[PDB]
Coordinates of C-alpha atoms in Angstrom, one line a residue:
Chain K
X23 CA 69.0 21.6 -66.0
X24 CA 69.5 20.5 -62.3
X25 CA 68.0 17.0 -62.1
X26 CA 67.9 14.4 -59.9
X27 CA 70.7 12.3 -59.4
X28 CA 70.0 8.3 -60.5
X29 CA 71.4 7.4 -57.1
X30 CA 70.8 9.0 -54.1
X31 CA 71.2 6.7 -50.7
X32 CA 70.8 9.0 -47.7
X33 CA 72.5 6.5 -44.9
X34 CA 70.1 6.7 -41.8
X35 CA 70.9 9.4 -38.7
X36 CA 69.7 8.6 -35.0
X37 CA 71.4 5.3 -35.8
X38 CA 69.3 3.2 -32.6
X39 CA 71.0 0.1 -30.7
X40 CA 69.4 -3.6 -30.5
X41 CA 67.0 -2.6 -28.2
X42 CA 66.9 -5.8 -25.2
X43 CA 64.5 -6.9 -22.7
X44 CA 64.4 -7.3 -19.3
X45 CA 62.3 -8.1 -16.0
X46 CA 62.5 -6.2 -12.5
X47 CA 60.7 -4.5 -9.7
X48 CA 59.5 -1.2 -9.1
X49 CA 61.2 1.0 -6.4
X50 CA 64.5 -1.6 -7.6
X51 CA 64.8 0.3 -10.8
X52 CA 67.5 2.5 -9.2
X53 CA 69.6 -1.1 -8.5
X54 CA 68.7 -1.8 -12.3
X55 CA 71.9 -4.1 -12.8
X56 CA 71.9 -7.4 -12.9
X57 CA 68.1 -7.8 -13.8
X58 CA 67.0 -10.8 -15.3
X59 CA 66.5 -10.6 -19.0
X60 CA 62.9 -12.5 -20.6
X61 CA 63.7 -15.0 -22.3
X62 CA 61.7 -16.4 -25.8
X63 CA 59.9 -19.8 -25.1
X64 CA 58.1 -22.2 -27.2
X65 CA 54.8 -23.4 -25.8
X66 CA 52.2 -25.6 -26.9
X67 CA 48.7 -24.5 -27.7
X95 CA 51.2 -26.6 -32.3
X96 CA 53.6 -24.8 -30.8
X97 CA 54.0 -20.9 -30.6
X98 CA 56.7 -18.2 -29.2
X99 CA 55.8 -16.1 -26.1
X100 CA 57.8 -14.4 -23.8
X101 CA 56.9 -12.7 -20.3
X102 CA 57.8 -11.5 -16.9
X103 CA 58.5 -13.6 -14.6
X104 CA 56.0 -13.7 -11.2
X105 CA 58.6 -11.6 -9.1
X106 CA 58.9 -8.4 -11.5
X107 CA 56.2 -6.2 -13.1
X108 CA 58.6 -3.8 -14.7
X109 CA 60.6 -3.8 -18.0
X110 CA 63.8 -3.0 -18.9
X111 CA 64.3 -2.3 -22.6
X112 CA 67.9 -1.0 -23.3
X113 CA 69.5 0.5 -26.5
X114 CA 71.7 3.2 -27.1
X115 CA 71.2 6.2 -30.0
X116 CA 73.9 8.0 -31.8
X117 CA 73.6 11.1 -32.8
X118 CA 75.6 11.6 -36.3
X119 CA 74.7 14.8 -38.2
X120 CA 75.5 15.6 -42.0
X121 CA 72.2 15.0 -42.4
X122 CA 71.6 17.0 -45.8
X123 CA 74.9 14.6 -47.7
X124 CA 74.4 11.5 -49.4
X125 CA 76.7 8.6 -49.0
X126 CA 76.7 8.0 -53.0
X127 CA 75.4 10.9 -55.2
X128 CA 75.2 10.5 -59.1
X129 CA 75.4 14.3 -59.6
X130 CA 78.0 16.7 -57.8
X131 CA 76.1 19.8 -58.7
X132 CA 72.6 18.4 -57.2
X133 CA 74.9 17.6 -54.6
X134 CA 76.6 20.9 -54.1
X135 CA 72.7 22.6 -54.6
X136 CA 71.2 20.3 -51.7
X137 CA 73.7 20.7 -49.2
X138 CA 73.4 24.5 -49.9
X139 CA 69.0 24.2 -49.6
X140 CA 70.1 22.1 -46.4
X141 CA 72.8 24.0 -45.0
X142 CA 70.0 27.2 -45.6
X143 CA 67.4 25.4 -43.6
X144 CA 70.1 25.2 -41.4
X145 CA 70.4 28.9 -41.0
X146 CA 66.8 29.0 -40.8
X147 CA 66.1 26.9 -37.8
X148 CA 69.6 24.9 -36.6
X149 CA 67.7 21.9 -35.9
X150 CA 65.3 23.4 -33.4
X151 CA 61.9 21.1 -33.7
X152 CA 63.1 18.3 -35.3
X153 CA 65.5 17.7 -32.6
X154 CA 62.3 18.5 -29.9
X155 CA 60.0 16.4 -31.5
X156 CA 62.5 13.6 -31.4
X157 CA 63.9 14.1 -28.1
X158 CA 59.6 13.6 -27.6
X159 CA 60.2 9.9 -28.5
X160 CA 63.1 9.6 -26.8
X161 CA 60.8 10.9 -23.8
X162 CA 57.6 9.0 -24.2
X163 CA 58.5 5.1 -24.6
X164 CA 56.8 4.9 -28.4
X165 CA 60.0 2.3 -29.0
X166 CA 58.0 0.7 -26.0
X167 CA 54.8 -0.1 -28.9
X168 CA 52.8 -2.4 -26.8
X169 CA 54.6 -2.4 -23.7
X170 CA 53.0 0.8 -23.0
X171 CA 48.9 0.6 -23.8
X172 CA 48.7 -1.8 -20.7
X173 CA 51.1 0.3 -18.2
X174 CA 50.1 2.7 -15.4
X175 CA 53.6 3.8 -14.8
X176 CA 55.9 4.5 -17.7
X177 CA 59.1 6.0 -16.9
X178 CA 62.2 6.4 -19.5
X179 CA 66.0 6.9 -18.5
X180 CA 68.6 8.9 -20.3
X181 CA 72.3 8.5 -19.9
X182 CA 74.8 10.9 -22.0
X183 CA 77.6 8.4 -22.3
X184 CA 80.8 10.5 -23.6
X185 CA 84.4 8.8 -23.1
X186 CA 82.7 5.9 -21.1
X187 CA 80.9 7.8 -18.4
X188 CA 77.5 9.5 -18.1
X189 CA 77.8 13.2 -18.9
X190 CA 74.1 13.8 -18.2
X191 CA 71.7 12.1 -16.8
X192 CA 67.5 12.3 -17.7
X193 CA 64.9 10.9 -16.0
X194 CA 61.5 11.7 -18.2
X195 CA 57.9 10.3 -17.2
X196 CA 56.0 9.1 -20.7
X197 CA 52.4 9.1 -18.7
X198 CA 52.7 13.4 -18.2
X199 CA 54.5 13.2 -21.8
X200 CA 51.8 12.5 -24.4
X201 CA 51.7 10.8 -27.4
X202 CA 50.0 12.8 -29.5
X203 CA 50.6 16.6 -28.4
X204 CA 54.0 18.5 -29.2
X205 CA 54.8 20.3 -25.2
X206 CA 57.9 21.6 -23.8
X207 CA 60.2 21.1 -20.7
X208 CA 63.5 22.3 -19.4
X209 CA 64.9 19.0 -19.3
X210 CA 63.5 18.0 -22.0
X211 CA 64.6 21.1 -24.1
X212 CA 68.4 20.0 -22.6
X213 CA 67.7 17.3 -24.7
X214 CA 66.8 19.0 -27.7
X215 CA 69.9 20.9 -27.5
X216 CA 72.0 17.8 -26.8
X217 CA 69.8 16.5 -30.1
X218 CA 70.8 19.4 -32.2
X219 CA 74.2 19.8 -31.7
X220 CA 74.3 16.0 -32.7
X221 CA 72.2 16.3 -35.7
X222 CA 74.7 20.1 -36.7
X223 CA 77.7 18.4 -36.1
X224 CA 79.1 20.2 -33.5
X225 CA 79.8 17.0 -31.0
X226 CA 79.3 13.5 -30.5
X227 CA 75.9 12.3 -28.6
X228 CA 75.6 8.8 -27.4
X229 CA 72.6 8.2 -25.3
X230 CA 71.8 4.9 -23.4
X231 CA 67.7 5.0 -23.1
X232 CA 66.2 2.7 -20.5
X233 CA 62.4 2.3 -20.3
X234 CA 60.9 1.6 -17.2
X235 CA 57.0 0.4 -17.9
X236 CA 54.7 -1.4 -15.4
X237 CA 53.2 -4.0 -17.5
X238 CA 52.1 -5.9 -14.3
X239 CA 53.2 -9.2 -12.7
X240 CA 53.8 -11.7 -15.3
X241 CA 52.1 -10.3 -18.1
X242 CA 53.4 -11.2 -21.9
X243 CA 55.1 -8.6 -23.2
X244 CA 55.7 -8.1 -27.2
X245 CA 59.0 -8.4 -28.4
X246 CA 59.7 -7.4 -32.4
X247 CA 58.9 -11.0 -34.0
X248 CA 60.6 -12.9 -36.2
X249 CA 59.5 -15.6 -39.2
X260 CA 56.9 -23.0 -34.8
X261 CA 54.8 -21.3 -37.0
X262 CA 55.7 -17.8 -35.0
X263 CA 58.5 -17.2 -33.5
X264 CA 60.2 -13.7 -31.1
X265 CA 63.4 -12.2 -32.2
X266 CA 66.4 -12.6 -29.5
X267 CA 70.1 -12.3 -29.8
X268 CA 72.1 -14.0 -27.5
X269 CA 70.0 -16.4 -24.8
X270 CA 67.8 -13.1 -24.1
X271 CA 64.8 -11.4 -26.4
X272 CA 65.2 -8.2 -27.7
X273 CA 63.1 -5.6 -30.1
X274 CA 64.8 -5.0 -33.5
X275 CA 66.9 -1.8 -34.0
X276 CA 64.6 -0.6 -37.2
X277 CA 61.3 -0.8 -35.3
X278 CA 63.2 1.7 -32.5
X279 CA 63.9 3.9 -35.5
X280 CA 60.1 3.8 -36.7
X281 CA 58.9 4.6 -33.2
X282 CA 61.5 7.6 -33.3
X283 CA 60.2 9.2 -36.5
X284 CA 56.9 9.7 -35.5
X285 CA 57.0 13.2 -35.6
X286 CA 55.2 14.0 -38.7
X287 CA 51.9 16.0 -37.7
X288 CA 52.0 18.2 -41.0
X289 CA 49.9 15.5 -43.0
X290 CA 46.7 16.6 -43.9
X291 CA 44.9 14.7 -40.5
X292 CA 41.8 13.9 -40.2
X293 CA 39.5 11.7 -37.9
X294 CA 41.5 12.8 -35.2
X295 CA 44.9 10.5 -35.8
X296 CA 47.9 11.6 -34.3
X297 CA 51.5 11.7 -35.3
X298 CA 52.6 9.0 -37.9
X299 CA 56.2 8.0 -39.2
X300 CA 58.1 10.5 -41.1
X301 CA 58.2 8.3 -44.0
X302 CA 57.9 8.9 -48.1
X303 CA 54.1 9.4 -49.0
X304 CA 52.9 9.5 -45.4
X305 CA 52.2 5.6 -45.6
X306 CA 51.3 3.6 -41.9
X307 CA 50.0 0.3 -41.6
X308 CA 47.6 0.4 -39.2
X309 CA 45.2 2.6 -41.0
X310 CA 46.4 1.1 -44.3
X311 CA 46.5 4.1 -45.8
X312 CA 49.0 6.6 -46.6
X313 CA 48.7 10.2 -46.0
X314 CA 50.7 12.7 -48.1
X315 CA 48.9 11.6 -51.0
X316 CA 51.1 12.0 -54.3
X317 CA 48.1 13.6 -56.2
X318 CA 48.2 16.2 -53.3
X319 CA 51.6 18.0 -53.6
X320 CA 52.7 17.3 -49.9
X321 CA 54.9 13.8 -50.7
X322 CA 58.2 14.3 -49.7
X323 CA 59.5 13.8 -53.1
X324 CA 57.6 16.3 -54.8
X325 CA 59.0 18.4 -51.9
X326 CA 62.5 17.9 -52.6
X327 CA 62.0 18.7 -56.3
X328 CA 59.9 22.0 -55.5
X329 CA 63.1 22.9 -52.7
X330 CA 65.7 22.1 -54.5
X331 CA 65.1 22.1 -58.4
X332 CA 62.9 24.5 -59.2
X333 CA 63.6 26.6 -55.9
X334 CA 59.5 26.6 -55.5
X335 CA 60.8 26.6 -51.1
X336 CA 57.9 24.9 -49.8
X337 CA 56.4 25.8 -46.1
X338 CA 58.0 25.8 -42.3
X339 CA 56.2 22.2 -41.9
X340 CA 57.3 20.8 -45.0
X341 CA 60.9 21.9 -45.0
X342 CA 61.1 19.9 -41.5
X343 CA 59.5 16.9 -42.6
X344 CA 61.9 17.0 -45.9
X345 CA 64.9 17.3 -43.2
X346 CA 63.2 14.6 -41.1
X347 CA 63.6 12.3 -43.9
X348 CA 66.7 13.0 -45.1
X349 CA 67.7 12.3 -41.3
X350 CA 65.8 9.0 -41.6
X351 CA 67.7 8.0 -44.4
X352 CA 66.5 6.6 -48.2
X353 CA 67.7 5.5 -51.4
X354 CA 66.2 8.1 -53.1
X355 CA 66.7 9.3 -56.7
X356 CA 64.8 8.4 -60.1
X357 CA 65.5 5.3 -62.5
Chain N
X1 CA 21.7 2.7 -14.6
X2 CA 20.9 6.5 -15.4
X3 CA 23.8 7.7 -16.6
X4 CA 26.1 6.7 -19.9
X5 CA 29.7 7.2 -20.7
X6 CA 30.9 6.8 -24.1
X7 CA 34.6 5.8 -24.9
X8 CA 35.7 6.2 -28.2
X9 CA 39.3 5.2 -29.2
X10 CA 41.4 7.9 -30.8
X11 CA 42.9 6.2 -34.0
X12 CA 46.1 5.1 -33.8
X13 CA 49.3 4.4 -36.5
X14 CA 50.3 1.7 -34.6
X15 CA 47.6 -0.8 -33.5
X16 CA 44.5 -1.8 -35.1
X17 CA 41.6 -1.1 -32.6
X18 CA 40.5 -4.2 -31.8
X19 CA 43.5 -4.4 -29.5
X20 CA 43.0 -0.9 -28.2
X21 CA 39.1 -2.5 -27.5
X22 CA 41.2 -5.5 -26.1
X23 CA 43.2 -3.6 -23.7
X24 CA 40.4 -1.5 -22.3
X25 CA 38.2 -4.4 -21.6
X26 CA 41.0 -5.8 -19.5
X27 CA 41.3 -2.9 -17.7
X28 CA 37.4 -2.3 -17.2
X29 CA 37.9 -5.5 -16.0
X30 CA 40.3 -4.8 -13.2
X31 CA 38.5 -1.3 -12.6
X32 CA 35.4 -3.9 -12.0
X33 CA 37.4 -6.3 -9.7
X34 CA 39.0 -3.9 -7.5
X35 CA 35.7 -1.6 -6.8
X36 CA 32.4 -3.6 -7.1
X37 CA 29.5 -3.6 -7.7
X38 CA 27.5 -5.0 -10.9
X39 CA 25.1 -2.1 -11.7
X40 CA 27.6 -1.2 -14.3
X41 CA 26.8 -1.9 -18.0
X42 CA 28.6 -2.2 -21.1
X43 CA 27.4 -1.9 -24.9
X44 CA 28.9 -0.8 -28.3
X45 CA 27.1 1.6 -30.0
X46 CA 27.9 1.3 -33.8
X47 CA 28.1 -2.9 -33.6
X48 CA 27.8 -3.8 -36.7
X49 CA 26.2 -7.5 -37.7
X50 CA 27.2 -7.8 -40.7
X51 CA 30.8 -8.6 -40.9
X52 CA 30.2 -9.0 -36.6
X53 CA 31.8 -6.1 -35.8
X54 CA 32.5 -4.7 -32.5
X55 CA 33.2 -1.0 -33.5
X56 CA 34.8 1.8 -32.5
X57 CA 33.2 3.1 -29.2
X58 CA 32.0 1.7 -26.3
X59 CA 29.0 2.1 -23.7
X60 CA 28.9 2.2 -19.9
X61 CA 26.0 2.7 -18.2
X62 CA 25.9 2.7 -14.4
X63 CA 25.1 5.4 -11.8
X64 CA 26.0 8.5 -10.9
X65 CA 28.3 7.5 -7.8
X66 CA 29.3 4.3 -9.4
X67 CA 30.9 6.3 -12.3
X68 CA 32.2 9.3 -10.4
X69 CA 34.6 6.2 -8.5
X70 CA 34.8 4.8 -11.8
X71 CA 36.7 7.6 -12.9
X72 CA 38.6 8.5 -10.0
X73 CA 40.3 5.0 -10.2
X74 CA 43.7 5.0 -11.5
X75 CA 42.1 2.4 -13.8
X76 CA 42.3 5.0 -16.6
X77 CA 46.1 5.8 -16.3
X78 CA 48.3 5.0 -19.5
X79 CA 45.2 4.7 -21.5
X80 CA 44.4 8.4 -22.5
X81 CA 46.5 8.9 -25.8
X82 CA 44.4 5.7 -27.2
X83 CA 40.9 6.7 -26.1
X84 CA 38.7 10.2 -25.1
X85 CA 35.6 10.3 -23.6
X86 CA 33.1 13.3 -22.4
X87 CA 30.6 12.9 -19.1
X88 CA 28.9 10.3 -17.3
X89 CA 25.5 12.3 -19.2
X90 CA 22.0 10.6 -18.7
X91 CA 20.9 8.3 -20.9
X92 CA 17.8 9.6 -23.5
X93 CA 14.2 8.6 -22.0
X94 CA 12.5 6.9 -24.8
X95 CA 15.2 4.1 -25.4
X96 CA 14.6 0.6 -25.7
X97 CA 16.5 -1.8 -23.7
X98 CA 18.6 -5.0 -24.9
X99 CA 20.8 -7.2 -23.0
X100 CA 24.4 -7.8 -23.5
X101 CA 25.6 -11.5 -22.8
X102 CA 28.9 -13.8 -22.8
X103 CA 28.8 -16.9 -25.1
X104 CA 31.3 -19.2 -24.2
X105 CA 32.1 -22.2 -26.5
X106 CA 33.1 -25.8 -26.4
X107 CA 36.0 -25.1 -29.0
X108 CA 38.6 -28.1 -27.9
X109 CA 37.3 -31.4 -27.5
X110 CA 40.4 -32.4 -25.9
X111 CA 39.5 -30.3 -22.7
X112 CA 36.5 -31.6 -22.4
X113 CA 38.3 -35.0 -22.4
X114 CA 40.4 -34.4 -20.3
X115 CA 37.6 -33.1 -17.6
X116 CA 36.0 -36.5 -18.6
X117 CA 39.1 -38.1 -16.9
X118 CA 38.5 -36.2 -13.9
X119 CA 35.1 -37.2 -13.3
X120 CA 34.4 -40.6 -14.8
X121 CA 38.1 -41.9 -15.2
X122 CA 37.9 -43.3 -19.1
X123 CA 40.8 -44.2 -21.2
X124 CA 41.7 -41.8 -23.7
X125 CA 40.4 -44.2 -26.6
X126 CA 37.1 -44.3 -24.8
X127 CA 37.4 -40.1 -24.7
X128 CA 38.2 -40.4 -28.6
X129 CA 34.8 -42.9 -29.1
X130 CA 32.4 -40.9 -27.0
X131 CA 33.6 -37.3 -28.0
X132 CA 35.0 -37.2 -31.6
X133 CA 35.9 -33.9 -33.1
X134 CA 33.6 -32.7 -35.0
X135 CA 31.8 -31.2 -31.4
X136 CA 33.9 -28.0 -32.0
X137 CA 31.6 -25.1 -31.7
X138 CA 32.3 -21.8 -34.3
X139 CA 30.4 -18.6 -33.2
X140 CA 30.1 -16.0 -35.3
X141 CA 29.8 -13.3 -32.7
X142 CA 31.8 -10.2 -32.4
X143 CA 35.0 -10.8 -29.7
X144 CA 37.6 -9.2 -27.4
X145 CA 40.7 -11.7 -26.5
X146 CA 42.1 -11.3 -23.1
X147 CA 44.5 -13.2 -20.6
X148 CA 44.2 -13.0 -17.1
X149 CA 46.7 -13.0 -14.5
X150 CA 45.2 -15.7 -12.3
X151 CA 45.0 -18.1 -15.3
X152 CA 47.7 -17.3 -17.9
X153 CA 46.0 -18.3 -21.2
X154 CA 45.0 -16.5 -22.7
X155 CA 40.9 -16.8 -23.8
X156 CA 38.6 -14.8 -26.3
X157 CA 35.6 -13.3 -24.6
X158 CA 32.2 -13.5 -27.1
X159 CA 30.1 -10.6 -26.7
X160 CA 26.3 -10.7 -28.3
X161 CA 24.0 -7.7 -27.7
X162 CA 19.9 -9.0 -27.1
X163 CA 16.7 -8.5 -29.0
X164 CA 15.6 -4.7 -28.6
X165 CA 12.8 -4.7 -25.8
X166 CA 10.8 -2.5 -24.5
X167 CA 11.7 -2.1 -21.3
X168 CA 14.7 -2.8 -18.7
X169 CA 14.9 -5.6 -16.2
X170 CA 16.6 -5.7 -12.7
X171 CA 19.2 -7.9 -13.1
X172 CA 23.2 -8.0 -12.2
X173 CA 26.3 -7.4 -14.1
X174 CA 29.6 -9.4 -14.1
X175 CA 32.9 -8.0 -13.8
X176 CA 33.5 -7.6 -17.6
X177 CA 30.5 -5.5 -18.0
X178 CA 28.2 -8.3 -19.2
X179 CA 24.9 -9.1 -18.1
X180 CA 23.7 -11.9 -15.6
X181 CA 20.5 -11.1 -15.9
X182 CA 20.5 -7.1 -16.3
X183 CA 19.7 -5.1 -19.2
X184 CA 20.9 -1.6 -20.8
X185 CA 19.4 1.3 -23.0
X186 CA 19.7 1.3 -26.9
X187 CA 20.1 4.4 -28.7

């Protein structure tokens, strides 16, 4: 029969760090220690939550590291062993396919452009994003990518960048470790507010520990947003690898489910019925197995 | 005054475009500061009244020169994923001409007390008796919201397009693109 199994919780891969804030000057960023981090403040206009630079720094400092796991194609807690057995074997032959060639490009993109920067970046002439390897405590190899050459919306290619995209792959195949500490560099301008994930004083910013921060999940959101296999139109670019295409902003959701390009109906073409879907579709299936779900029927 | 520009924003997953308008007013704004000049003209050319609308394009109309140094200001850096744009192209010859205006508003009594302190020097009771609140204005106008760096709240700029003339008049332009007297083409 080969059906899906009632549970099927896919942990999350490119597992992202607390992503912090903090305030400097450009042309200091190489002496980007000891900067001081923003800090949330309640102001009265009732009283709302803002947080911005300071007057003497027009540069932020937004810090979080990114692990590389790999095993993306096993569940944590599968129902069935045999439609677990059948999709490591579809996985491990997309494997032999491509070993993890675009996805780990198009990622090592959001690494490159600062899209976990989401508004810290409309308002900035100078966006610059630093990549440490950290392995056994010191940096393996260092990046130093520009996000205004790297665009948002097209899908380029770079030396150092494609070092990435190996470093990327190997993570996501298994065949090492990678641990990446990614600091943005934008110039948002002296003092202006910056926007911090926010938490629910009628509004109030997220922080952690006497110093604001963005949330970990809206890093990983920015780092999905690869999928540019949706049926576009109006001229939208990439949106979230997420299940039935689905963003916000738009509210709409591409990958329609009466179209068959959802991600389940993908799955149960690739794996169940062996109906292999296209090049595109297969790396948007993988993309969201990386991403995680608690996928499975009821 | 010849020649138009049109700026349409790119849609994107992550922001609704009134902030992407928001954001390239400010910078038009600082492009406007830091070179000059108030022959430059601003529209919207699907503003909708029904819902008050702003859209999602927008309209410069200047010179030649004036938009050739418009351009090569690093104004537009950062800002080219959001939005595209073609040529500064001539405008169409028959095209009627409206003007473009900023409507402030009296929305908080209490700083218009508190000016009243600093020019007659009332009590606050007598602030309360000669002011009450009810002078709150509500405009119904389509809006950008901004903050500045000189003063750091942050304020919501009220933009109303004119009655459709027939002709243009010589008049100025402000720094955000709004007239002080000047007019721009319809169409």
């Amino acid at each position: 029969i080969l059906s899906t199994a009632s549970v099927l919780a896919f942990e999350r891969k490119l597992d992202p760090s607390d992503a912090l804030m903090s305030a400097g000057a450009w042309a200091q960023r190489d002496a980007s220690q000891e900067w001081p981090a923003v800090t949330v403040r309640e102001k009265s206009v009732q009283t709302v939550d803002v947080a911005n630079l300071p007057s003497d720094a027009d540069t932020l400092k937004v810090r979080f590291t990114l692990r590389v796991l790999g095993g993306a194609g096993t569940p944590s807690a599968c129902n069935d062993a045999a439609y677990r057995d059948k999709l490591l074997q579809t996985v491990a032959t997309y494997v032999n396919d491509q070993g993890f060639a675009e996805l780990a490009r198009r990622y090592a993109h959001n690494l490159a452009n600062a899209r976990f920067l989401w508004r810290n970046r409309v308002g900035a002439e100078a966006v610059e994003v630093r990549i440490n390897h950290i392995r056994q405590g010191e940096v393996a190899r260092a990046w130093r990518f520009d996000a205004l050459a790297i665009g948002l919306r097209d899908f380029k290619a770079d030396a150092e960048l494609d070092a990435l995209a190996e470093l990327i792959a190997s993570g996501l195949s298994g065949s090492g470790h990678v641990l990446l500490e990614v600091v943005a560099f934008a110039r948002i301008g002296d003092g202006q507010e910056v926007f911090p994930s926010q938490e629910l004083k009628s509004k109030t910013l997220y922080s952690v520990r006497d110093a604001a921060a963005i949330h970990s999940q809206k890093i990983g959101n920015a780092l999905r947003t690869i999928d540019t296999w949706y049926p576009d139109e109006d001229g939208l670019g990439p949106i979230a690898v997420e299940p039935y295409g689905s963003v916000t902003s738009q509210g709409k959701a591409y990958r329609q489910p009466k179209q068959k390009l959802d991600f389940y109906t993908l799955l149960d073409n690739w794996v169940l019925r062996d109906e292999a879907p296209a090049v595109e579709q297969q790396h948007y299936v993988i993309a969201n197995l990386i991403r995680g779900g608690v996928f499975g029927e009821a | 005054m010849d020649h138009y520009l049109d700026i349409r924003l790119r849609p994107d997953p992550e922001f609704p475009p009134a902030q992407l308008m928001s954001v390239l007013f400010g910078k038009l704004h600082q492009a406007l500061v830091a070179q000059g000049g108030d022959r430059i003209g601003v529209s919207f050319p699907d503003l909708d009244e029904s819902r008050s609308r702003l859209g999602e394009r927008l309209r410069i109309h200047a010179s030649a020169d004036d938009l050739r140094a418009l351009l090569a200001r690093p104004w537009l850096e950062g800002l080219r994923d959001h939005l595209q744009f073609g040529e500064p192209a001539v405008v169409p010859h028959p095209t009627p001409y409206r003007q473009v205006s900023r409507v402030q508003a009296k929305s908080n009594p209490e700083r218009l007390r508190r000016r009243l302190m600093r020019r007659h020097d009332l009590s606050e009771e007598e602030a309360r008796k000669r002011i009450p609140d009810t002078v709150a204005r509500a405009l119904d106008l389509p809006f950008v919201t901004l903050r500045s760096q000189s003063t750091g709240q942050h304020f919501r700029l009220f933009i109303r397009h004119g009655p459709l003339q027939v002709t243009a008049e010589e008049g100025g332009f402000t720094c955000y693109g709004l007239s002080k007297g000047g007019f721009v083409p319809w169409f």
